[PDB]
C-alpha cells in the first residue's frame, strides 16, 4: 500500500510523492534533489525531527497519508 507524502523545501517548494510503505526513501530524496538541481549532500530531509536516511521506509518512520517531509539546505564541514 502506498501513501501520499508532501515534500516541502524552505524554498516553499512543494513536490508530492506516492511511495510504497515498505520502500526505501532514497528514490524520493534523489528525485527531489534532481528536480531542484541541488546535490544530495547539501540536503537535510526531516520528518518530525528525524533526519531521513536513504534506507528509512515510511513504515519505519510512522508516516501516514498526507505527511510532510521538510527539506533544508545543509551546509557541511563545520
Amino acid at each position: 500500500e502506498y501513501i501520499k507524502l508532501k515534500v516541502i523545501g524552505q524554498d516553499s517548494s512543494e513536490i508530492h510523492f506516492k511511495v510504497k510503505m515498505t520502500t526505501h526513501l532514497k528514490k524520493l530524496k534523489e528525485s527531489y534533489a534532481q528536480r531542484q538541481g541541488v546535490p544530495m549532500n547539501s540536503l537535510r530531509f526531516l520528518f518530525e525531527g528525524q533526519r531521513i536516511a536513504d534506507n528509512h521506509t515510511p513504515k519505519e518512520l510512522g508516516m501516514e497519508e498526507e505527511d510532510v517531509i521538510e527539506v533544508y539546505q545543509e551546509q557541511t564541514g563545520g
Binding site: 512543494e14 513536490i15 508530492h16 510523492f17 511511495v19 510504497k20 524520493l28 527531489y32
Partner: protein
C-alpha cells in the same frame, strides 16, 4: 482521480497534434502515451516521454480521423489511472 489531469490538444494540423497535460504537484518518473483511431481495427501506437515533460507531439496522423489519446503516469512501480481524450485532425 486521474494523474495527469487537464489532458488537451493545444495545437494541431491535418496530420499531427500537440497535447499537453498537468501533473499538479506529483513527481512522475515517466509517461506512457498511447493513441489509435477511435473505433479502429489497429492496436494502439505507444510511446514514452520523461517525467519532467508535460507536452508531446503525435504525428503521422491522417486528415479528418478521430483518435483516442491516453496518457499513463508512473512513479517507482506505481501507475495512476490514465486520462483519455478524443480528438479529430
Amino acid at each position: 482521480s486521474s494523474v495527469p489531469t487537464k489532458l488537451e490538444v493545444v495545437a494541431a494540423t491535418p496530420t499531427s497534434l500537440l497535447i499537453s497535460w498537468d501533473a499538479g504537484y506529483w513527481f512522475i518518473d515517466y509517461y506512457r502515451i498511447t493513441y489509435g483511431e477511435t473505433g479502429g481495427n489497429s492496436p494502439v501506437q505507444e510511446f514514452t516521454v520523461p517525467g519532467y515533460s508535460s507536452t508531446a507531439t503525435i504525428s503521422g496522423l491522417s486528415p479528418g480521423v478521430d483518435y483516442t489519446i491516453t496518457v499513463y503516469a508512473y512513479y517507482d512501480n506505481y501507475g495512476w489511472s490514465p486520462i483519455s481524450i478524443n480528438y479529430r485532425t
